[PDB]
Design a protein around this ligand. Structure first.
Ligand SMILES: Nc1ncnc2c1ncn2[C@@H]1O[C@H](COP(=O)(O)OP(=O)(O)O)[C@@H](O)[C@H]1O
Ligand SMILES: [Mg+2]
Lengths: 167, 411, 227, 281, 314, 178, 120, 227
């Protein structure tokens, strides 16, 4: 229902306001330094979580803190075959969360993938290029899904001829 | 169940396949896969990525050692699986072609090299449960199986259940102590010297001296002389003097066949014979940064074990894996340990004025015919038991937890 | 037998046609259907020369470009070529990969008077006749509707291509038995609901609204309520 | 592998070694090996009564007796004949070879040994193929419970032998992929005209079977091959039998390996996204 | 303006020598480096190594010429130039959590360290045991303290809490001062008296500053507001809502105009109307300090950011 | 570790310099006297050579090791030349031509181990170093000529030439350059 | 053992009056922000999203521009409420208000939504 | 300083070079293509210093890597690099002659005669490095001795049945002249043994005359100092 260009622009601006991190040594352990969004041990360091949504299926949650922000996405599963392709796409990507440095090794329940951005990343990597990555991820993922669907048809169509032809 | 479980042991040199309960592995094959190749059609636009059904044109094992038109790959290195795409293609053809097993109806026992990271135990479990829908898997410690192979083979009067096993396969050598059926995980040591680096050392040592070896076959001949002519010597510099003075006869000849021209070629075989096996005793010959002789690494293990089990461990050292087959390899390690242990007791004599003489430790190093497949044969005698079917993870457990059911390891 | 000459021949010919102006009615003595059938076999089986898998893309590009100046559903010598062929497994596959990404292969040069988007043009001809509609395998037909209904709902209003994709859907509903199986229908109805109500003024959108109305009044199953 | 080879490779390899070594004149050594197969047919190779000079092979088919009703013994009497012996107790059929009497070349003998599964199934198919020549169709459906969950039905219709596999897709991930594969099979007749026609039903048994109370469930598929006379005649039948009897595992094998193909491309497309993020450093 | 980059990684805090001819900056590590204006370029001259964790605050006492540094190490040290070597000195900070900020008082006899312990520690020197000893302002603090600024009286200490509120406390150490002169923020001031507290309830306070006439404070808040509060009026606050990103640092530059910087990475400017109390925005990362002229009439200022380096202005 | 360290350092032997001055058995001339026993530091470096070059680590256990490591490097330099010799007779004279070359003395720059050898402080050590290190080389060469050339054909013998590629802990008496 | 047991813890009358901009100006009169109430917060949104969906695109520009700075900040908090459970197509309208509201309020009007400790 | 490192690291990648795993060839080529250009586009004073940088370790790496790599597609690029490197400085020649590179070329040429394109460069490089006629390790006569000379005398007389360009006869004359140059006197000369050992000395015996009347010689193409 909602078109792509207005929806993406809204997510960009919100995420630009949330990416305002600073370093913060924790209050509740002697000198540990940890992302407040994950440990949630303090509860005045947390920002109000906000959702942007294109329709009832596609939405983004932006959830910030003085030193960290978490972004979690859900994508339109347009048919049964696409659920399986999508889930496995995430797993093989998420399996390299040590190279996608902003990526959590697990999604949030009810979300398909989720990024944890700490102050160290926004100090060590160009902020506007991380946001461009998150936007680019949404610009492509349903093209990248559909391309596998076209190829999975082709594989089966070859396998059928390879069996039937030898009769 | 009625159908037997599969036992699939994968090493960095060889893999060993068969159903449980057999006395002996039903396939021994090299751990190699020969994938299809192209004239730079794979390039910066896309590397080694296939389309349609082009990915299924490949072979594994000896069916892949000698095919001309394919690029040979070796997925397992230092025992660890390095490229899971090739390993999964390897596993499929093991099951659906070599074993003829239906994965959905046979339990699998599959082997952990004691160094491997937990992520690799997740990924190997993801294969069997989520790719193949195996009904249940178990990941076995290779060294404990090797001990069980000795245990069932050796005489019932000395089935001690206690010993240190040295498992110098290819990849890395493990030295592991087991006391009365429990792995003492704290004391396990890894030595990087293994059959590959002994091969590589001999390969370089030839290629500097004996050019004429064709580049396609340097590795084959290096392996041959390692297997056929090499031995652990009595004293390093005393051999060099013997090889100089009796160079008419300690020097040997190997004849190879040119794979391309089918002309023969000959090489003189010499200092290669005792260098190599002595890399276990002088690891700095092959690695910049390991130096303790194997005969002094094994001592540190026992000396870290609980005080009561120390003497029994010396009484029963078991040799496992192919590289331990070298001539005199047992004799020398026993001599070095014996010379170390009784000298250690000579100190505690003097700190007590010779007032009491300690009962000297006897040391034994034991060679047995299973050495080429003791890991699988142990695996078969385990996976036969009705107990084994309850130690395995049932498939539902992979559903309720994640693949994390294989995070744990006994180290 | 000259692989490189063959490769450049197809490439340069596509470049030559890429601007889309009508040839005099004489070139078709060669570049008509007898040539198009040959190109299809070069895609569907190729030549032992082509160890680079490179002739397929060149000939697929040539077929699209060569269609870019053909007026109508019967005069189109290229659509005749598909109709008389035995079976077009591989060409069916390759074409949807282009529509999925949305690019146009034929615009290799960048001269100003941009022609119609070659692939959207090519499909609108393919569905011009029910005999040529049959070429697609059924699993591709489903994927085609999913691909086109993704695009129609992604573009903004006023975008030049929306008046194309609306035409492709109208063809699909016409000559292909879409209303038998309704693959995306409870989604497309909700899309047509809002574009029909979309309050914008530009001629691009005015043109959009006209075809959307026509798309409903031609088949009352569309524009009626989802259910 | 696209197709699945029909010879049991372990049987070839064990016997080839024994007969090469024996014909080379080496004194024999024991063999004591048991190994499975598709459909849970379980082999054993053994030395009968400990005679290292004799070698025996046995089949153990779970569904032997119901197949045997269609005359399997008179097939084995043909292809093996003098190499048959009494059932090794516990196994349905047994084959015996003498290391003393190996003929001057062995290859066909060891190849026939390798097919000792397929040679059982051929007896039910060669029947209904032939009845089509006799023009009869009144004979009842064959039934082979080739697994616990799975059953194969055969009917000779006047023109067409029809074989109807019932098979269970063990997972939500499998059944969704299987629904694609079988859909392409239904259309395979377009790609290569001479092939037999294929039909598929997503859950329900097809109507022609329903008097048999065929199993119903979200995981059950019914797959029909319609074998025309060009496939069943006396020239073709051996080739058709080698194929159809494998079909169940051929379909599953590709459903499994279709995953590996997807997994490879997901790693490639991951590497694409990674290069995009890397511009943020 | 001018720019220079000392390092790729964040310059978490800076301080200046009295005559500005040297700066101290922390290279995102457990040290502080001192640079000298050897030409246009900067030359590193000294390297203070003693901390055991990342430092997060510096102040370089102008006349005393001694540097205070604190950090997650919890330790703070006052550094004396004992000949050609800076030597540290112990401070018995009783804090149980990470230190966050430090500033010297104008009389240079005391300093205060903020921390995550939900306290401010005021410090003065014991002569008899060679260490600096602390007293804590502790009562209405309830979250970490992010920024400190000292009133011209060296007694009143404004403190930005991560508690959505800006507070002013009398840090009157009787061992060091006569009872403080009367002030519009209130004549009653023992140690730890709560002089003022912001009306609002949202957004962390990153920065606070006192005008050179102490009657106006302003503070800068993660809700993208700058506020100024006036003690010539009855402590009346006025707030400007703005369309910038958050601002991290603020300082006065005249008695009635103000300057700030933040996540937009550029300076911005405000004026304060004495009549209506309305602020206004004039416009144009992590610290601002006036280089010449103080808060009475600024004529240059410096800014250092996480993006690296410092800038100097006009 | 178990590399072959120098055996001869009996404390009754004079110990001039930063290295064991030792009684080089030769008909050449120099500061060191004549050993009479059948074993000597040049014979020791020759004897242990084939083993020593494989050990990638080597301590200085005593002063005599700072001699032995230098003799070993010169032995390698012999092979780097004799390998080219067309016959044993050339292998002798073209070795003497090497012995009287101006090798960097350990305290001189361009010697590879300047960290390990102290500077010779005065002429009465420096000139002793010139007169000792030549007496090492002059003798060391004449001993290899007799045993690198196996007597059947005055080929430089293959087994020795194998070691031409191998250098004792990868240090070279060519220094930074010849 | 021991370490297991954790320790340490009116609008309709303006809408149908045609100048429906006067309704939205009235809809901002009912903030529940300061209250502890929760059922009222569910009422507050429904009284506004019914208004937001009524506008023609000819007006949604001025309907923002006629607000004060508090009005825009007030509006953005209602916008981010409708996104939490969209209507069947109303996201198409909230994203269109968002376009206008963010043009007037800038990203600063978002930040004092993210930091808003009490909300409508 | 980068390219020499990333090669010298694949040398002594002991695992990969004998038991391969990754798609290494497609990147190694990119280094060698770049190196071949820079070995001639740079100031020779730079590349000379990078060769002699550390007792020629840069050279001995590539020389070792040539022996180590059995792929014919790369070897051409290593030979082309040795071509340029030979030109920079006679000191580099004095390394290569004393090194393993000649002997591997001697074996490759006798064995891989099918690789005509590489075989031409194989002859050329061997002729270049010998051009200075320094003394050669006596171990080399185990291959570059009389048998290899007779193998050359075949090619100049008979050519090759596969020889499309027929160049190799000339390059073999250059190579025979080059190998001869260092040989002492006329007693032991391995080539003069070969010439005495066949009656197959016709076209070679004549072709030497066409050089003699030309008065020049093809050797010393580099004209380094002690010509
Ligand atoms: N006769 C022999 N002497 C010494 N080593 C041998 C001999 N035969 C085989 N080997 C070594 O045994 C190895 C066989 O594989 P093995 O080490 O048993 O399994 P893995 O691959 O699991 O380590 C060969 O790689 C070789 O290194
Ligand atoms: Mg192993």
């Amino acid at each position: 229902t909602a078109t792509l260009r207005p929806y993406l622009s809204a997510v960009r601006a919100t995420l630009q306001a949330a990416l305002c991190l600073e370093n913060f040594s924790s209050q509740v352990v002697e000198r540990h330094n940890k992302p407040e969004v994950e440990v949630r041990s303090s509860k005045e360091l947390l920002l109000q979580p906000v959702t942007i949504s294109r329709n009832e299926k596609e939405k983004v949650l932006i959830e910030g803190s003085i030193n960290s922000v978490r972004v979690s996405i859900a994508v339109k599963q347009a048919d049964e075959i696409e659920k399986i392709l999508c889930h496995k796409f995430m797993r093989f990507m998420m399996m390299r969360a040590e190279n996608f440095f902003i990526l959590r090794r697990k999604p949030v329940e009810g979300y398909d993938i989720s990024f944890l951005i700490t102050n160290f990343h926004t100090e060590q990597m160009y902020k506007h290029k991380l946001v461009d990555f998150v936007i680019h991820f949404m610009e492509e993922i349903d093209k990248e899904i559909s391309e596998m669907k076209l190829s999975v048809n082709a594989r089966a169509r070859i396998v059928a001829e390879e069996f039937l032809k030898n009769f | 169940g009625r159908l037997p479980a599969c036992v699939v042991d994968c090493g960095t040199g060889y893999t060993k396949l068969g159903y449980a309960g057999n006395t002996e592995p039903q396939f021994i094959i090299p751990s190699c896969i020969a994938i299809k190749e192209s004239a730079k059609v794979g390039d910066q636009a896309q590397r080694r990525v296939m389309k349609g059904v082009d990915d299924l044109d490949f072979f594994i094992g000896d069916e892949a050692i000698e095919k001309p038109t394919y690029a040979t790959k070796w997925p397992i290195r230092h025992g660890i699986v390095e490229d899971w795409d090739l390993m999964e293609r390897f596993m499929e053809q093991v099951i659906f072609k070599y074993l003829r097993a239906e994965p959905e109806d046979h339990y699998f026992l599959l082997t952990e090299p004691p160094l491997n990271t937990p992520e690799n135990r997740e990924y190997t479990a993801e294969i069997m449960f989520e790719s193949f829908n195996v009904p249940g898997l178990y990941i076995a410690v290779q060294a404990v199986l090797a001990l069980a192979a000795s245990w069932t083979s050796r005489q019932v009067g000395e089935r001690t259940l206690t010993g240190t096993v040295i498992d110098s396969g290819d990849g890395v050598t493990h030295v592991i102590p087991v006391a009365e059926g429990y792995v003492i995980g704290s004391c396990i040591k890894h030595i990087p010297i293994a059959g590959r680096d002994i091969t590589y050392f001999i390969q370089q040592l030839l290629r500097d001296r004996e050019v004429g070896i064709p580049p396609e076959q340097s590795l084959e001949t290096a392996k041959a002389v390692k297997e056929r002519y090499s031995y652990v010597c009595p004293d390093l510099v005393k051999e060099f003097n013997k090889y100089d003075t009796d160079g008419s006869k300690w020097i040997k000849q190997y004849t190879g066949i040119n794979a391309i021209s089918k002309k023969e070629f000959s090489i003189d075989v010499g200092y290669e014979r005792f260098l190599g096996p002595e890399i276990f005793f002088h690891p700095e010959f092959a690695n910049p940064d390991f130096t303790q002789p194997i005969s002094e690494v094994v001592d540190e293990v026992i000396q870290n074990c609980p005080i009561d089990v120390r003497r029994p461990l010396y009484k029963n050292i078991v040799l496992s894996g192919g590289s331990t087959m070298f001539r005199d390899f047992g004799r020398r390690l026993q001599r070095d340990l014996k010379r170390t242990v009784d000298a250690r007791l000579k100190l505690s004599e003097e700190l007590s004025g010779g007032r009491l003489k300690p009962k000297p430790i006897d040391v034994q190093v034991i060679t047995h015919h299973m050495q080429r497949y003791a890991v699988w044969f142990g695996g078969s005698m385990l996976a036969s038991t009705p107990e084994f079917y309850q130690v395995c993870h049932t498939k539902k457990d992979y559903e309720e937890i994640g693949p994390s059911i294989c995070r744990h390891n006994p180290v | 037998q000259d692989h490189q000459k063959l490769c450049y021949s197809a490439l340069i010919l596509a470049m030559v046609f890429s601007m889309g102006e009508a040839v005099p009615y004489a070139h078709y003595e060669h570049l008509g259907t007898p040539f198009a059938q040959f190109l299809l076999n070069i895609v569907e089986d190729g030549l032992p020369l082509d160890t680079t898998e490179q002739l397929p893309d060149l000939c697929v590009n040539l077929l699209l470009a060569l269609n870019l100046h053909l007026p109508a559903a019967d005069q189109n010598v290229i659509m005749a070529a598909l109709s008389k062929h035995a079976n077009v497994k591989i060409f069916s596959e390759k074409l949807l990969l282009l529509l999925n990404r949305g690019d146009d292969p034929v615009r290799i040069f960048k001269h100003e008077p941009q022609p119609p988007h070659s692939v959207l043009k090519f499909l609108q001809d393919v569905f011009g006749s029910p005999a040529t509609a049959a070429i697609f395998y059924h699993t591709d037909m489903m994927a085609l509707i999913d691909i086109t209904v993704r695009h129609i709902a992604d573009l903004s209003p006023g975008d030049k291509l929306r008046m194309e994709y609306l035409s492709l859907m109208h063809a699909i509903v016409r000559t292909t038995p879409y209303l038998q199986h309704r693959h995306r229908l409870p989604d497309l109805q909700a899309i047509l609901r809002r574009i029909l109500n979309e309050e914008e003024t530009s001629p691009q959108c005015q043109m959009d609204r006209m075809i959307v109305r026509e798309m409903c009044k031609e088949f009352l199953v569309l524009g009626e309520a989802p259910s | 592998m696209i197709l699945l080879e029909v010879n049991n490779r372990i049987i070839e390899e064990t016997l080839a070694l024994k007969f090469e070594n024996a014909a080379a004149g080496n004194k024999p050594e024991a063999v004591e090996v048991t190994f499975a197969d598709f459909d849970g047919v379980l082999y054993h190779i053994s030395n009968p009564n400990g005679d290292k000079t004799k070698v025996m092979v046995s089949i153990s088919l779970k569904f032997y007796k119901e197949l045997q009703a269609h005359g399997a013994d008179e097939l084995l009497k043909r292809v093996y004949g003098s190499y048959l012996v009494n059932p090794e107790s516990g196994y349905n059929v047994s084959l015996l070879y003498d290391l003393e009497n190996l003929p001057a070349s062995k290859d066909s003998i060891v190849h026939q040994a390798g097919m000792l599964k397929r040679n059982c199934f051929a007896s039910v198919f060669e029947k209904y193929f032939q009845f089509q020549e006799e023009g009869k169709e009144g004979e009842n459906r064959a039934v082979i419970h080739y697994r616990d969950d799975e059953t194969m039905y055969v009917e000779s219709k006047k023109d067409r032998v029809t074989v109807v596999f019932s098979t269970v897709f063990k997972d939500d991930d499998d059944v969704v992929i299987g629904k694609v594969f079988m859909q392409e099979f239904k259309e395979g007749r377009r790609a290569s005209h001479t092939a037999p026609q294929v039909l598929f039903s997503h859950r329900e048994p097809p109507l022609e079977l329903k008097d048999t109370d065929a199993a119903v469930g979200d995981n059950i598929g019914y797959i029909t091959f319609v074998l025309f006379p060009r496939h069943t005649n006396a020239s073709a039948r051996d080739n058709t039998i080698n194929l159809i009897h494998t079909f169940r595992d051929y379909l599953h094998y590709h459903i499994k390996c279709s995953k590996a193909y997807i997994h490879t491309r997901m790693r490639a497309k991951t590497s694409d996204f990674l290069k995009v993020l890397n511009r943020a450093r | 303006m001018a720019y220079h980059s000392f390092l790729v990684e964040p310059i978490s805090c800076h301080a200046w020598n009295k005559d500005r001819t040297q700066i101290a900056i922390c290279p995102n590590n457990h040290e502080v480096h001192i640079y000298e204006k050897s030409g246009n370029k900067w030359v590193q001259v000294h390297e203070l190594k003693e901390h055991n964790g990342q430092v997060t605050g510096i102040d370089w006492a102008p006349d005393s010429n001694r540097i205070v540094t604190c950090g997650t190490d919890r330790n703070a040290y006052v550094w004396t130039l004992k000949g050609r070597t800076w030597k540290p000195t112990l401070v018995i900070l009783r804090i149980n959590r990470a230190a966050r900020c430090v500033r010297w008082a104008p009389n240079e006899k005391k300093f205060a360290v903020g921390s995550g312990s939900r306290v401010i520690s005021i410090c003065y020197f014991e002569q008899e045991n060679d260490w600096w000893v602390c007293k804590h302002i502790k009562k209405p603090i309830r979250s970490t303290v992010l920024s400190l600024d000292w009133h011209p009286n060296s007694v009143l200490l404004a403190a930005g809490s991560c508690d959505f509120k800006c507070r002013i406390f009398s840090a009157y150490i009787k061992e060091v001062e006569e009872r403080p002169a009367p002030t519009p923020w209130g004549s009653k001031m023992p140690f730890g008296e709560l002089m003022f507290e912001s009306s609002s309830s949202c957004g962390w306070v990153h920065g606070v500053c006192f005008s050179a006439n102490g009657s106006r404070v302003a503070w800068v808040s993660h809700d993208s507001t700058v506020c100024l509060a006036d003690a010539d009026k009855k402590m009346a606050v006025a707030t400007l809502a703005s369309e910038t990103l958050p601002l991290l640092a603020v300082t006065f530059i005249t008695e009635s105009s103000l300057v700030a910087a933040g996540h937009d990475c550029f300076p911005v400017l405000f004026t304060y109307d004495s009549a209506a109390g309305k602020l206004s925005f004039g416009g144009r990362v992590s610290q601002i300090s006036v280089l010449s002229g103080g808060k009475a009439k600024c004529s240059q200022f410096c800014t250092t950011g996480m993006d690296g380096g410092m800038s100097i202005w006009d | 570790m178990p590399a072959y360290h120098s055996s001869l350092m009996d404390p009754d032997t004079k110990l001039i310099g930063n290295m064991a001055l030792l009684p080089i058995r030769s008909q050449f001339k120099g500061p060191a006297p004549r050993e009479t026993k059948d074993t000597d530091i040049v014979d020791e470096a020759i004897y242990y050579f084939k083993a020593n070059v494989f050990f990638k680590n080597y301590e200085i256990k005593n002063e005599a090791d700072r001699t032995l490591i230098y003799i070993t490097l010169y032995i390698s330099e012999c092979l780097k030349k004799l390998q080219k010799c067309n016959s044993k007779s050339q292998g002798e004279k073209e070795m003497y031509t090497l012995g009287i070359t101006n090798f960097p003395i350990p305290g001189e720059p361009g010697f590879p181990l300047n960290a390990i050898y102290a500077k010779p402080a005065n002429k009465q050590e420096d000139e002793v170093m010139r007169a000792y290190l030549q007496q090492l080389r002059q003798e060391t060469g004449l001993r290899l000529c007799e045993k690198v050339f196996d007597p059947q054909n005055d080929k430089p013998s293959k087994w020795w030439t194998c070691f031409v590629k191998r250098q004792f802990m990868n240090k070279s008496l060519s220094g930074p350059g010849q | 053992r021991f370490r297991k047991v954790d320790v340490g813890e009116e609008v309709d009358s303006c809408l149908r009056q045609g100048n429906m901009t006067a309704a939205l100006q009235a809809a901002l009169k009912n903030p529940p922000i300061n209250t502890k109430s929760q059922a009222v917060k569910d009422r507050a949104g429904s009284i506004v999203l019914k208004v937001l969906i009524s506008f023609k695109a000819n007006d949604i520009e001025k309907a923002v521009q006629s607000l004060d700075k508090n009005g825009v900040d007030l509006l953005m908090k209602y916008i981010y409420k409708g996104f939490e459970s969209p209507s069947d197509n109303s996201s198409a309208v909230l994203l269109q208000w968002h376009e206008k509201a963010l043009a007037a309020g800038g990203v600063g009007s978002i930040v004092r939504v993210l930091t808003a400790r009490k909300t409508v | 300083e980068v390219i020499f490192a990333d090669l010298a690291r694949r040398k002594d990648d002991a695992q990969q070079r004998s038991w391969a795993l990754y798609e290494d060839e497609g990147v190694i080529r990119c280094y060698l293509e770049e190196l071949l250009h820079i070995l001639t586009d740079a100031d020779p004073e730079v590349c000379k210093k990078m060769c002699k940088r550390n007792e020629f370790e840069s050279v001995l790496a590539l020389v070792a890597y040539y022996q180590m790599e059995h792929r014919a597609s790369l070897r051409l690029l290593l030979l082309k690099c040795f071509g340029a490197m030979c030109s920079l400085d006679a000191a580099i020649i004095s390394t290569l002659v004393s090194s393993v590179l000649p002997v591997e070329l001697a074996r490759d040429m006798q064995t891989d005669t099918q690789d005509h394109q590489k075989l031409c460069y194989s002859a050329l490089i061997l002729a270049m490095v010998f051009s200075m006629g320094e003394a050669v390790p006596y171990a080399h006569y185990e291959h570059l001795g009389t048998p290899f000379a007779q193998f050359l005398l075949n090619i100049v007389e008979d050519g090759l049945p596969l020889d499309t360009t027929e160049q190799l006869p000339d390059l073999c004359v250059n190579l025979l002249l080059a190998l001869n140059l260092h040989l002492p006197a006329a007693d032991q000369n391995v080539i003069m043994a070969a010439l005495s050992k066949h009656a197959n000395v016709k076209i070679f015996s004549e072709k030497l005359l066409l050089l003699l009347n030309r008065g020049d010689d093809p050797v010393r193409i580099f004209k380094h100092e002690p010509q």
